Amino acid sequence: MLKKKQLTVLDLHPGAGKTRRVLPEIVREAIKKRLRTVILAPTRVVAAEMEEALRGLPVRYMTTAVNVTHSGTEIVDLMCHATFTSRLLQPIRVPNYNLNIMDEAHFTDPSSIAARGYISTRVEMGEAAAIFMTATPPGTRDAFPDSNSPIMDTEVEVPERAWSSGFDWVTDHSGKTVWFVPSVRNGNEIAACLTKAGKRVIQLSRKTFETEFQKTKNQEWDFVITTDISEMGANFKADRVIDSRRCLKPVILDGERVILAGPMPVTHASAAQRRGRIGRNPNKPGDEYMYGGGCAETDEGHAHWLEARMLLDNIYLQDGLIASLYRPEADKVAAIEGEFKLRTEQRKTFVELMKRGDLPVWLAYQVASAGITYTDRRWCFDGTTNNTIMEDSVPAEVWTKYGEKRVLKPRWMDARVCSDHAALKSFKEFAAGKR
Ligand SMILES: COc1ccc(C)cc1NC(=O)CN
Ligand SMILES: COc1ccc(C)cc1NC(=O)CN
């Protein structure tokens, strides 16, 4: 695996021990061979689980998620996928790692796709080796892979709204259920319905995942209601998954705005990872997977692959060369390579809008490429009437940094800035000049 110009897909089935058994063996061999190695975790939660898997091995944990005192001598780094891509974009020296290991390498967030494109390009150049660890590589067509224990798979109508009758199987269950919903707002409705029926519910989404995931260990629960973020190595002591088989797809319309289309079917990879939360214990056969729809390749034309091109166009590789997406996921976007390359100062603005600004990549790019500086929020108010953001059926309003009350009406409308109460609160703070 560890030889230059090799990219290995470690595609053992979910729960086969890729992280707890195989990874430490790879790391030991890498240190022996004096390979400068990076290990990429999808989330802080997985970063902390990896520290447990790798304990006593000399690894530099480049995250506050791990409380360890480093020796200073480590040649293995561990960081999150997004941290890798972030450091590549910034004017910070990132070592040219001899061995690049990506755990949960199916993750479809723009920074993960970009990281795979950069890494696979270095491997193609003959510069490096890589290992992509996932049960579900890009373009997998298998929603029902092998498991540690037999799974009961049932196609059934799954509620996506509060219900009064017709779904007794949902609440009659005495075990623990992980329920994949397509959005935070949809999870809120299902969660309230379950709570009203006497169930103990924990809700997980990207912004809340580290804090709320700990509740799955510290409190008794009946249901976890989660978005797709629990596809990325989240482990539960559960005996049932309920899968809507639905997701939201961010779509760029007429190069001009981003909508959250759907809900629509998940990919086969997503479905397999959702199901893969259960069947993990060879001593507990007959975990249940209840699924409410079919799969489709909804990653085609999904904004995250164009956003990944925006990131890669702005990462130095060698002279004017630009890293390609990882070949198996490269046709998910129609882009001209280099079309999003920004000059140094617009690039710094683009980076700051994504990090400090917490804006979606697409929206950060529209603002930075327009020659707007990071602190200039006039664009949050001067859009068309149809760009008016609504909050409880009234136009959303903020006090501008000038002290003027204005309707939020961004020049570029990205539905991700107002997809739920938390998102809109963050965007209101941004529009007001508060970060
Ligand atoms: C929302 O945060 C980001 C936005 C954009 C990029 C490329 C990375 C990050 N996150 C990190 O760098 C976390 N350490
Ligand atoms: C020669 O190109 C390839 C052939 C096959 C595979 C798996 C990857 C690449 N290259 C890339 O994916 C560059 N990002």
UniProtKB/Swiss-Prot annotation:
* Binding positions (ATP): L12, H13, P14, G15, A16, G17, K18, T19
Write down the membrane topology. Peripheral membrane protein
* Ranges spanned by the short sequence motif DEAH box, renumbered to the chain: 103-106
Q: Where in the cell is it found?
A: Host cytoplasm; Host endoplasmic reticulum membrane
Q: How is it modified after translation?
A: Acetylated by host KAT5. Acetylation modulates NS3 RNA-binding and unwinding activities and plays an important positive role for viral replication.
Q: Locate the region Important for RNA-binding.
A: 3-6
Query: Which stretches face the Lumenal side?
Result: 1-435
Q: Where is this site: Involved in NS3 ATPase and RTPase activities?
A: R274, R277
Q: Out of the domains of life, which is the source?
A: Viruses
Q: Where is the Helicase ATP-binding domain?
A: 1-155
Q: Which residues carry this modification: N6-acetyllysine?
A: K207
**What sequence ranges are listed for the domain Helicase C-terminal?**
150-329
State the protein's purpose: Displays three enzymatic activities: serine protease, NTPase and RNA helicase. NS3 serine protease, in association with NS2B, performs its autocleavage and cleaves the polyprotein at dibasic sites in the cytoplasm: C-prM, NS2A-NS2B, NS2B-NS3, NS3-NS4A, NS4A-2K and NS4B-NS5. NS3 RNA helicase binds RNA and unwinds dsRNA in the 3' to 5' direction. Leads to translation arrest when expressed ex vivo. Disrupts host centrosome organization in a CEP63-dependent manner to degrade host TBK1 and inhibits innate immune response. Inhibits the integrated stress response (ISR) in the infected cell.
Summarize subunit and interaction data from the UniProt record for this chain. Forms a heterodimer with NS2B. Interacts with NS4B. Interacts with unphosphorylated RNA-directed RNA polymerase NS5; this interaction stimulates RNA-directed RNA polymerase NS5 guanylyltransferase activity. Interacts with non-structural protein 2A. Interacts with host SHFL; this interaction promotes NS3 degradation via a lysosome-dependent pathway. Interacts with host CEP63; this interaction disorganizes the centrosome and inhibits host innate immune response.
Q: What is this protein called?
A: Serine protease NS3
Question: Organism classification, top ranks?
Answer: Viruses, Riboviria, Orthornavirae, Kitrinoviricota, Flasuviricetes
